[PDB]
Amino acid sequence: VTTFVALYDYESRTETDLSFKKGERLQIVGYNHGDWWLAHSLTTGQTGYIPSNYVAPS
């Protein structure tokens, strides 16, 4: 699968967003030209919204 890598730690602050740690691998399951992407964490298996500027491509 194509993956992005987290640049920073992020603590979930909404009912729909996803917590993740720096360096973790995320599979983006919904791209959007905006501040939020829908991501699937390969570390935890959870799915939710993340800040698009918090990840970089592999």
Residue numbers in the entry: 83 to 140
Describing publication, verbatim:
The Src homology 3 (SH3) domain is a ∼60-residue modular domain that consists of two antiparallel β-sheets orthogonally packed to form a single hydrophobic core. This domain is present in many proteins and regulates critical cellular pathways by recognizing polyproline-rich motifs (PRMs; Kurochkina & Guha, 2013). Three-dimensional domain swapping (3D-DS) is a mechanism by which some proteins can oligomerize by exchanging identical domains or structural elements between monomers. In previous work, the 3D-DS of the c-Src SH3 domain has been characterized and its dependence on experimental conditions has been described. This work explores the role of the hinge-loop composition by interchanging residues in the RT and n-Src loops between two SH3 domains: one being the c-Src SH3 domain, where 3D-DS has been described, and the other being the Abl SH3 domain, where 3D-DS has not been described to date.
The structure of this chimera shows eight molecules in the asymmetric unit. It is worth mentioning that the Src_Abl-nSrc chimera has low solubility (∼5 mg ml−1 at pH 5.0 and 7.0) compared with the Scr_Abl-RT and Scr_Abl-2 chimeras, and well diffracting crystals were obtained only after applying micro- and macro-seeding techniques in the presence of lithium chloride and glycerol to increase the protein solubility. At the same time, these conformations are different from those found in the WT c-Src and Abl SH3 domains. Although introducing residues of Abl into the c-Src SH3 domain is expected to increase the number of hydrogen bonds and reduce loop flexibility in all of the chains, residues in the n-Src loop of some chains show high B factors, and the loop has not been fully modelled in two of the eight chains (chain E and H) present in the asymmetric unit. Interestingly, although the conformation of the RT loop is mainly conserved, residues in this loop show the highest B factors in all of the chains. Introducing the Abl residues into the n-Src loop of the c-Src SH3 domain does not increase hydrogen-bond formation, as happens in the monomeric structures of Src_Abl-nSrc and Src_Abl-RT. However, Src_Abl-nSrc shows an ordered distal loop in most of the molecules in the asymmetric unit and this chimera does not form the intertwined dimer. Nevertheless, no amyloid formation has been detected for Scr_Abl-nSrc. All chimeras exhibited reversible denaturation except for Src_Abl-nSrc, which was irreversible.
